[model samples]
Target: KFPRVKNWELGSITYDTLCAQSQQDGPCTPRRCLGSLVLPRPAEQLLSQARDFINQYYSSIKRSGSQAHEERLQEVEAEVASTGTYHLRESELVFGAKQAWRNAPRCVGRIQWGKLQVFDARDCSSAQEMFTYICNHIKYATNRGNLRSAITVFPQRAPGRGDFRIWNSQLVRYAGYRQQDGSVRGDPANVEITELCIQHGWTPGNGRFDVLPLLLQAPDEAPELFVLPPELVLEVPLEHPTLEWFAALGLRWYALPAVSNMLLEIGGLEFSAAPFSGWYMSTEIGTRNLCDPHRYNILEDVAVCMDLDTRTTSSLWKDKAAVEINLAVLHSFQLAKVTIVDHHAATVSFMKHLDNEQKARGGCPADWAWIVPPISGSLTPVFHQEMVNYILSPAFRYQPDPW
Candidate 1:
């Protein structure tokens, strides 16, 4: 937020700089960096065709007039997504299974974020696939050799499962359904559990299997956290949850105006606001923008690989989402370990060590307007601290700008 110059213009300059250099090293660098890569259009087209088939499969899962047949239809759909063509012949299925594994050496050319990154089509498809492909390619290019250059394109991770009880409710749905030993612990009381759920302001249909825990029975069940427990219940305001609740969870309040109507408009249900009336759950809260200044990610700017309707462990792997275009300081500290506090007080001392983000793009903001609360504090990294620091340490964060 430097008041001096236009950030959009600065970004444009950076874009032009990267564009001029095709031989730079990076995971997502252009093909010019890579010596030679074979782009088989036919092969990529097959992937597109296969994706279309999978798309149709997913569509069928929600189709009408198939109440009794829903389970059967859903199973067949999963098979197509994971199954490979038998025509690949014998052990080569292993090779073909990874046949389309688009590596970064091909995408980024040389492994470095400073170098020019590139994006191309594997048969222009969904936004999720494209973002994932480019991001993953960047990782491939870096190969963990350049700490500053290595970063996985995505932020989320697969679920951390535990025995019959999965930590993630969505995964639990899938695990419970498929486990022969009756591993699934959801809805042991069936629809009866939902009858008592009105205490939390919920309806059975809204509790559909994928959304999981309409009753929101789970540890740390904040309901606001999407995992409210049975005995403890609280109401969501007719409006969005207060900033206090977000701070309590050490999270920033990300307003999602678009999805504000999800609770009221859907199912014709509404709740009291202000003092916080009878219980209700805010279904979708949109996405997180870890770096609001550099990566001002928004909900419309993103989706998820996992289907919001995914009901099983596989839900963790919906395998696609939309992420806006942005670059990170490779091999730099992400600073997620720093605890977020409810008060602005907590951020001051800690952020002092990390407030040089302005130097990253250009000069430091003479005005400290970006100084923020612990929730809005920089760095909600997905990776562990040591790994994050080594790779995420931004070269510019410490260097004096050409003042």
Candidate 2:
């Protein structure tokens, strides 16, 4: 049976035929729907997934039934049968990386999916080498603020050896120091990693926005800490367009939102340390990072500074301050010439992406909660759009942290 998805705002509907292709089951059942959960509770005959992926690759290039496609399939079978694993060619890796981005259900920026730069780091052997590769990836993706989407894949998980891992959740994250007063000094989300970095002999910085070092673990060894060069980490000093005093808060964020912990599974082989990045949507920084009670939690501070009546919920002070904060993030990124998408523009593009995917693939797999921006849930077009969430291969997956 196919799901009939609807767009409430547009009064349009589409039957999701593509969900039939989903090989993995999600958390949803006939009794209850758990589609709103942030993480789905957690593969296969090697030959089948590999063959399917190869078929997809060939089909993408319009050579689905060609003799070359048949031969490639045979080659994969031979490799897997002989060594228990097969390797992706450089072109195949590039295609798979893009496909993974396209298949990602949580990403709202899938419209830019095909534009990713895939850096083949599968030949990496050491923690130091991973650091270098990551640094290069950061440099290329950052591009001095005009950010580019990129993914650098480390070697795949081998049968006998341990997996290559980037211990840091993101290639770039602010250090969260636990103060004596039982409060976190920086990003509350990153406190564990910060403590881990310190335990690994990293000299921690005592600042609200100190950038944490990378913890690159190369198979069977303790993780090595590598500090990213400050110049390579482009940061935007936040400022408001009209509020002159906003700049004095000395708040800033890294330009590159490179997530380092997700596993990139391609053609039945898993690249455990494939760090990937795309430009941030403004609300990710402004609303979730800045305003979320568990994160920086700056809403009350900004509200107080804006002189809004914080005494009662009826004042709507939180909403006002959040709007200004989001505006400041947009303004700062724009003034700094960094690539960033505002919530409205991002959601509009996502609507286009949904339409495009519907035409090309019969349906698009999307998580409604994530596709809708953290702030302004109902204002965005995606809010009214019903989405079918399913697992698709050549996918980026959250893995166990390498702690």
Candidate 3:
């Protein structure tokens, strides 16, 4: 299938209509791009001396000299790299992505995994049973119900379901607390810190199937045990019909209301209208019988949780049409409308833009563990391969400012 050569077609993006030209001249605005698909790591993210840890002299690298000379010089990132999830099936995730594509074939990392499921890293139940068998093989092999596609798991998003948890987490220095199969975590109970504002989410009966609804909280403190500021929220109680319980599973929801003073008398019901729904997963939640003429009302309530926590009562979304349609597959864009902007102070501005560039370049902040948020119930089936480190592949662009 790689014979199509230079024609890539499959268009549509709408993270609020992707607009960020601001004024290079004005009118050409349509390039607020975004594309993720990344993989590579040598002994756990060898960011090449992390740029030199501020000129490493060794006193935690000379009293943090410009972050130990930027963690020791050469820094090209991948953040958390341990994919091939550690194989569980599909012949151990295609033999661990073909042996990590023959052990870094040239080093940009990862040579295959497009149709989704290929993140095993040692059987998290055979890596979510190969992510629900590749999102149910792209929901019955491209029958096309609102045409949405994604598959990026490695650092579990929700397999057997718990999506990893948090109550005061530093993953306890690499796992501790939350493992009845919540995927290793438990054994550092300072359960008496008295005020460690942190409450995470992912466990507690994840609504049955398809769950990423957060329980976000960050007043601050515990930088090493539960780092997160990109944003997380899961407090629902503003008339939590939750789109009438996701319309009893046929799904077609779109609520984005943020509220405070949370209190619900569940089951007997008594709410006020803080349902805040920005979910956009659809393997076939119903295209309404698809006769097709362009009908995607699917998950489009048009944004609203720009930001609000009320101390972990949850609400934080930027779903301008799911981040401009997943960044319009890198700018072949054609969006016209999308709304959701209250951005409560730039909503953690991309983790404070990677925490002021990891403290001006000392490194080690994208603790995303290879970020992959919403997987819901099924995914994986797009297949493309190449890059066993195409030279420490990160496609070099970051530099937003570590100076």
Candidate 4:
């Protein structure tokens, strides 16, 4: 049965016929719906999934049922039957990477999905080699702040071996130090990783914004720590357009939002260390990173600095501070010539992407809570758009921590 999807603001409607192709069950039931949940929780007859993926690839080129398509299907089946696995052609890997980005439900920047640069690193065999590949990826994706979307896929997970892993959640993150007072000094979200890095002989930095080193694990070995070269990491110093004092707070963030922990599944093969990156959305850094209570938590500080009445909630001081913070992030990134998208423009583009996908596939899977911006939820068009969430193949999935 096709699910009905609607735009509450425009009174538009569409039936999600595309979701019928989803083979994995989601966290939904007849008694209740969990569509807003962030995570939903694959393997197959290896030959069947490989065949399906081959068919999909051929269909994209309008070559389904052709002699070449049939040959490729036979080749895959033979490979699976003999070795229990098959490798993707370079072109197939590229197509699958873009498709994975396109099928990602949590990304609002899917309009640029087809433009991703896929780097094949399947031949990587050592932690040093992974560091080199990652550094190259960072250089290419950062592009001196003119950010580009890219992914570098390491070797696939084998049947009887440990998976290669990037222990850091992201390629770049600040070290979080636990102070004597039981308060976190840097990014609280990174404290455990920071400790892990230190335990592995990484010399820790004392400053709040110190970038942490990478922990790259190759096959069955203990993770090795590698410090990224300073030149490879691009950072932007944040300042307000009008508030000159805002720069005094010394806020900054990395230009590339490269997620390193996601598992990329293509056909029936899983790439355990496929680190992918895109430019940051302004609200992700400004609203969530800076203003969230467990994060930097600068709202009260900014409010106090602005001399806003904090004696009562009626003054709306926190709301005012949040707006200025978001604006400052936008202003700073623009000043630095770094690529970033404001929440409004990003959501608007996502609406266009939804329309494009609807015409092409009859429906698009989307998570409502994540698609909507963290701040000013009602101001964006996606806030009122009803969505259906489901599992899609050739996808990026969160895996368990490498530890």
Candidate 5:
């Protein structure tokens, strides 16, 4: 085992072996301390951005720069000189997290970036504490079906020890089981995690949408798994507006799409356990979750129900099934009083986000590949909008799995 490395811009890093041994006769085994890194953010760049952040905070509140502003800048300078790293105050962390969401090129739902709630959990000392924090996040964000965008940030990395992290891709996800018959029982993307849970003593459930437990790891400790309480999780039953058979499929999805595995980098400080969420766009569930070949693989099933000629590509069976599945997703969430946006509505808002960013920042960064919907790419306004992509600080970023 080795210390885990993740995105960091600037800081000294060191690793140490905890023990050395073969398969032990007793409970002792070889151990290692897996933690190390720097911001990779240069001192000058950090200083410039720190100043800009302080200035922006002051301007937003309609107040002149105060001692707090100068003091934070001084801390940034002093820490950078001593440790080659700096820390963010609460205000800066909040501002940066929101800006990170806004600057995330791959996200199609940036229109609500400003509404994200940042729950600071940096002082937590154990995986159990992390589990409690995540449960609270789920319950609060779920909001009884009216989901809200939220993120819970944990402690950042330090020399000689690794940062804390949540291993699941999302706070809410379905389990995937590799059946002996060379088939999957749930979401195939989650096969490894589902197996890990079973190895850690989780009783696997035979359901298409079984919610996986949180795989929480404290800094330098072997990761521990914990199951979320049933009440804390909110699920919406899938149904169609007119197709009566749709409800019989017994489909469902969790209310919150809180991504737990992304790294939240703020001012070169990496929060490996900053789990964030936004309300879902219907297609994310309908097109990707239920219809992706690697996921539920239900397109053909729905197509058969539609009585399409599934045997021929010219019939466009998959395409026809996808539209109705997505329609069902929209109808189900709406009827359940949960928050969901159709792809068209979400893209329209993204266009407005681009306009607002243009007037405010001269341009907006976006990934054309991700901005277009999987179902109706050619039909949405964002499909034709020429765009540029670039990096911005205080961003939610993907990181390698700790396992």
Candidate 6:
């Protein structure tokens, strides 16, 4: 339980949030605490590379010699010379969004990177407007089970007001209520955000899979909770192929996995309201959502239901239960005619992506810990290959949670 010292494209970031579980106390100990734990960004480098990207983009489009493209480049150069920064044009913004998806090292669905539909909602100035955009986003991206990848960009940063932001980690999520008896009523990953919602007048749900309301916040205003319309959110009910008892567990997952909290950087600007989505890889739902100890923690119960000896470690009951749970997810999605990828298929596609990128761009940037599926790591070709992770312009990155 040491501090997670990780390297991104910028540099190293240290996370002390889990330091309490450390075997040895360090500078991030409970008592002798450091200042703000927020990781620093390589803002200047990002700016320089973004400008380089703009030049490269124009060249790639065969418009580098065009007067319009040259003027646009000169305009940004002048702005940077005078004001030290500049904004991306609408075309630049659109290209950047797509490139960000293409450059996402962790995503297994990069095969569709160039096909992403970019929505320009940068004019959205209030929470209500943001909510409307989000609803429309869900409807279009969900596509009645044939999910389409998309991202909606909001306004960038500015003086005093800052940037508009969607407070939820994903566009759709389950509420997590910490019961008085010390058990969780829903998704444990969302406990803090759920409490914040209730404090802001949200009526919490009692079920294990209650869809969480979006806590959308404008630059300066307080966050407002908006419940997602039932029809807009497509969900598939989980069931096992052979086990009759699996359906009794009442497990289900939303069809679209739309991440709402990541920052999208284009040119020198960072848009915080860029919510992106792709069809889910099964393990993201099966292994992490259902099997993680801090999440649903259903492994023991699943093992017992499988008639496996859960009391002993030698029998590998947990592994068997996990496989069944994952199989149920895959089977359920297939039965519903929803677009979902099993880990095996997803990783194989990623290996193809790596090969294609290598031929096209000389090298591919990948994070091993992320590119590898949570379950059955060695079976996939990605597990055997070495990986290199780096930052590039027009990238999607995790920011600190909006509270």
Give the lowest summed-lDDT range of ten residues in model 4: 35-44
Candidate 1 vs 5: which has more TM-score? 5
Error of 5 at 376 (Å): 1.2
Better of 4 and 6 by lDDT: 4
Query: lDDT of each model, Cα atoms only?
Result: 0.23, 0.90, 0.23, 0.91, 0.79, 0.80
Question: What TM-score quantifies how close candidate 1 is to the native fold?
Answer: 0.18
> What lDDT tens digits, residue by residue, belong to model 3 across residues 1-403?
1111110122321121111211112111247412233422143422333222112223222455465334433222332233211212233223323322222222111212122233222232332343343334334322222222222122223123332212321111112233465432211222222123224322322221122222222112222232222122111111112223322323212211221112111111111111111112121112221111133332233232222232332343323334423332112111211122222222223333323333543221121212112321112111111001111111111111100
Candidate 2: stretches off by over 4 Å: 42-44
> How big is the positional error of residue 369 in model 3, measured in Å on the Cα after superposition?
18
lDDT sort, best first: 4, 2, 6, 5, 3, 1
Query: Which whole-number lDDT from 0 to 100 does residue 14 have in model 6?
Result: 37
lDDT of 1 by residue, 182-246 (tens): 43322332323333333455533432132223221112223321332322211111111222222
Higher-scoring candidate on TM-score, 3 or 4: 4
In the range 311-357, model 2's lDDT, one tens digit per residue, is: 99999998999999999999999999999999999999999998999
lDDT comparing candidate 3 with the true structure: 0.23
Stretches of model 1 off by over 4 angstroms after superposition: 1-6, 9-29, 32-211, 214-355, 358-403
Which tens-of-lDDT digit does each residue in 138-164 have in candidate 4? 999988889999999999999989999
Model 5, range 1-403, lDDT digits (tens) per residue? 5342221322323221211211112221248321121122166766666566566666656664777667766777788778767777777788878877887878899988889898988879999999989888888898888788888889887766877988888888999989999999989999999998888888889987889988899988888989899999888998899999988998888788888888987665678888988799999999998988888989888888889897899878879889999999999999989999999999999978876775666566666778889978878877777655446665666688898
List residue ranges in candidate 6 displaced over 4 A: 1-50, 80-85
Error of 6 at 91 (Å): 2.2
| Range of the 10 consecutive residues with the lowest summed lDDT in candidate 1 | 272-281
State residue 161's C-alpha deviation in candidate 2, in Å: 1.2
Best by lDDT: 4
What's the lDDT for residue 287 in model 4?
94
